[PDB]
Design a protein around this ligand. Structure first.
Ligand SMILES: Nc1ncnc2c1ncn2[C@@H]1O[C@H](COP(=O)(O)OP(=O)(O)OC[C@H]2O[C@H](O)[C@H](O)[C@@H]2O)[C@@H](O)[C@H]1O
Ligand SMILES: Nc1ncnc2c1ncn2[C@@H]1O[C@H](COP(=O)(O)OP(=O)(O)OC[C@H]2O[C@H](O)[C@H](O)[C@@H]2O)[C@@H](O)[C@H]1O
Ligand SMILES: Nc1ncnc2c1ncn2[C@@H]1O[C@H](COP(=O)(O)OP(=O)(O)OP(O)(O)=S)[C@@H](O)[C@H]1O
Lengths: 400, 102, 390
């Protein structure tokens, strides 16, 4: 089911539109949490189910006393988990100063339980998380196609691609490290790696003999980012993180340090940690407000108010074009046209019904997925779809 | 271009390139695509010769596009007007024994 | 009746001449108290009617004691009012200079009524005057089109359009503020706004917008003069609270040498500056070559404007296009001895023998609304409501 302005389309009018759209000045991508299910990840409600199975005792002190969640949502599995840890951190910070010892333990013990459950779901390889060359495995086969197709079709004098994402995992990095590409994420150094926001404006250049690089924005954080002293934020490697903190989290129990982690949007009240989150949305708007721009979306559930606000405000500029993927149009149209559904359904539906030739929505269940989004993108001509490399490397290694 | 599983050659003279580009040579595989036809018409194709500058590619033509309207063969004496008729005629006979030629 | 100087034309014969005159370098438009009716305005006659049948008792001294008005034209309902105001200000000033009581009070009592009846007509929206976005409404729909097309019909590297005006209200401002273009009127500042004549020579420019000028000839409601000899501009929400409200809802109070509208206090060397500086610009705009001037709403009852538009025509590349609704009703009265200069001049104009004077008349097909349509041509709400509710 394909709709442009309410009216329907056919695959051959759609594939001839994607190509016209990918030839523009600025191009971008915005992914989500579903894109990472073909690799070993999970979804936010499959997280809540597992939480309330194993920890049903702490689930009363959270609905009765402190009013942190509602029963309808707890029953229908419609809870935001990145918006609750922040509030709990606020509560704990307040209790530390107010000096009420009867309330700090009961929050340590229920934050140790939430972090243990969100971390375990982002490794994507289990105990094979601290090893090397995890981008050769076949699970990461389309993340490479995406990058390669986005790069291989640009011309001289045209800006490079940007990739925004809400996940906090390491797949795109594991893939680029195996393709031989460079991604800029705002950090510099190896023995001490630090955040420099002034280097989203840099680029490469060759002297005599280059344009293999891209920009990556992560909107909620990462497991490799942390804070040691007041004024700075540091990045490390997987093998180093696993040995410092990520292990006790899983195995040990009743382990919680404090304002030390930068995932997901948790300690947003300090002034050294929110400076990192704000720059990303800043650059998002500054990109989405240029002329001759195109944006593809996939994996996003539309449960955030600010991003929808930004997009709707951006659509006033006549040179902005969008493409969306939502495999529940039918299951939502009725639930919203009879009496009403949920804010996500309402929002996503308001766009289907407009007089716009620069909007587009796509459905079909397993036909609007990631392994199929990656296949509507054009493939270049000179790019080789053949591998006489491995047959030579095999002989080089067999030589003896 | 490249559409579904192969290539196709369009003939329209307007896609001027951009500065700072890179010019490259053509191999012997981007040349058949140029001097080739559709591949559903191969059952209706006859072989005439090869390219003269390189002598690598082979040339095929569609019978129902040749012998639909009339055909002109022009040439001076001693250069091969009668060696092309005895080749275009002893092929339609070996391919379509239900045919009337005079 | 499209008369064209001793000849006749048709709709398209006119609608192509307009497209021709719109390609010139110097374009100019002139508007009076007529084009302001569709939005809620009143002509000079209704205000005199109202003054007659609202303040009858004092109407006699104007004809018996001080001799400011003529009984004949008073009855005929054709009497100029701003000249009367100007002269009454002079009388009041003399009677206050030489210390006399009764004649002072007797004029302080008349100025109030006159200013009251003249302000009410120009408020133009009632009590929504001290509010915002009054240009989104439906009455101000044709001014926006006028501006949009008169600007769009311009070449790069060309001059900018000129709009002269005889009204003293805020419509063309309210409308441009809705579109999003910049008008220049000779004022600058926000916390203390002042008059700078040499600002008419400025113009914007980009580095990596469009604008226009506006010449009023009789003043406005938002200009005034404080105890110090400088002339200040103000916004409506502020003026309303400052003076206007009392003007409209108090029976007797007056402030002399304060207001600037309409040609009232010209006997002060600080106020006549700002009036003269407009007419001389009018002259210097006329005297240019390759210029066109579209007149819609003016009654030709003025010695000076008549003289200037008359002398302007000697050099041939100045084109005039008048609009006048009731034309034959004067053609058929000039045959006899009766007739007023207003009609004598326009018939003298239509009795010319060159292809510049282009009088027009349709009774109701020569109006602002059709004037607009005679010209060529070059979802936000849904999205903003969605964002609103979201
Ligand atoms: N294989 C697949 N391919 C593509 N899409 C899929 C697949 N599987 C599921 N989906 C779709 O993936 C979607 C899963 O939606 P969720 O993971 O809950 O949302 P989020 O990850 O944006 O949550 C983070 C936000 O939550 C807060 O509001 C913050 O502001 C964050 O922005 C479903 O619609 C599925 O149809
Ligand atoms: N809807 C309409 N559209 C177009 N024209 C109209 C409309 N309604 C009326 N008219 C015409 O509008 C005309 C109204 O004429 P008046 O208002 O007396 O003239 P002025 O506004 O120049 O008065 C200002 C002068 O008064 C002092 O003498 C000063 O010297 C000023 O210069 C009528 O002829 C109508 O046909
Ligand atoms: N492709 C070819 N390869 C080898 N020999 C050729 C070729 N084309 C022509 N010839 C030779 O050219 C000689 C004479 O050509 P002809 O067939 O007589 O052409 P033609 O004389 O123009 O045709 P006419 O006048 O109708 S007999 C023959 O002996 C052929 O061997």
């Amino acid at each position: 089911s394909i709709y442009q302005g309410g009216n329907k389309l056919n695959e051959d009018d759609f594939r001839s539109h994607v190509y016209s759209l990918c030839q523009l000045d600025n191009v971008g991508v915005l992914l989500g949490a579903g894109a990472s299910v073909g690799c070993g990840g999970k979804t936010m409600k499959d997280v809540w189910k597992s939480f309330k199975q194993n920890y049903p005792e702490l689930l009363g002190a959270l609905i009765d006393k402190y009013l942190l969640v509602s029963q309808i949502d707890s029953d229908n599995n419609l809870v935001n988990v990145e918006l609750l840890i922040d509030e709990a951190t606020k509560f704990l910070s307040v209790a530390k100063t107010r000096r009420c010892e009867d309330e700090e333990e009961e929050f340590r013990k229920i934050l140790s339980s939430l972090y243990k459950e969100v971390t375990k779901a982002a490794l994507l390889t289990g105990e094979q998380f601290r090893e090397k060359n995890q981008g050769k495995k076949d699970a990461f086969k389309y993340h490479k196609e995406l990058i390669s197709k986005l790069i291989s079709n640009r011309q001289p004098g045209q800006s490079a691609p940007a990739i925004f994402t809400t996940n906090y995992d390491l797949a795109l990095e594991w893939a680029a490290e195996d393709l031989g590409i460079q991604l800029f994420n705002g950090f510099s150094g190896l023995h001490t790696r630090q955040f420099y926001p002034q280097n989203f404006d840099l680029a490469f250049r060759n002297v005599n003999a280059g344009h293999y690089h891209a920009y990556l924005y992560k909107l909620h954080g990462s497991l490799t980012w942390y804070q040691n002293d007041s004024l700075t934020v540091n990045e490390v490697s997987a093998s180093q993180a696993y040995d410092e903190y990520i292990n006790d989290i899983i195995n040990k129990d009743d382990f919680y340090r404090g304002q030390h982690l930068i995932y997901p949007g948790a300690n947003k009240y300090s002034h050294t940690i929110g400076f990192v989150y704000g720059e990303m949305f800043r650059r998002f708007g500054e990109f989405i407000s240029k002329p001759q721009t195109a944006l593809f979306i996939n994996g996003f559930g539309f449960g955030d108010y600010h991003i929808n606000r930004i997009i709707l405000g951006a659509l006033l500029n006549p040179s902005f074009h969008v493409v969306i993927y939502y495999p529940e149009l039918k299951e939502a149209i009725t639930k919203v046209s009879k009496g009403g559904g949920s804010e996500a359904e309402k929002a996503i539906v308001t766009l289907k019904n407009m007089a716009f030739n620069q909007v587009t929505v796509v459905g079909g269940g397993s036909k609007a997925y990631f392994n199929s989004f990656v296949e509507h993108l054009p493939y270049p001509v000179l790019f080789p779809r053949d591998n006489i490399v491995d047959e030579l490397v095999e002989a080089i290694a067999n030589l003896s | 271009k490249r559409e579904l599983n192969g290539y196709v050659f369009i003939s329209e003279d307007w896609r001027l390139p951009a500065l700072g580009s890179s010019a490259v040579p053509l191999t012997s595989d981007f040349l058949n695509i140029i001097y080739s036809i559709d591949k559903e018409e191969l059952p209706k194709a006859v072989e005439l010769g090869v390219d003269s500058r390189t002598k690598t590619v082979k040339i095929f033509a569609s019978v129902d596009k040749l012998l639909s309207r009339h055909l002109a063969v022009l040439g001076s004496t001693g250069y091969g007007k009668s060696n092309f008729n005895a080749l275009l005629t002893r092929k339609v006979s070996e391919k379509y024994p239900n045919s009337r030629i005079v």
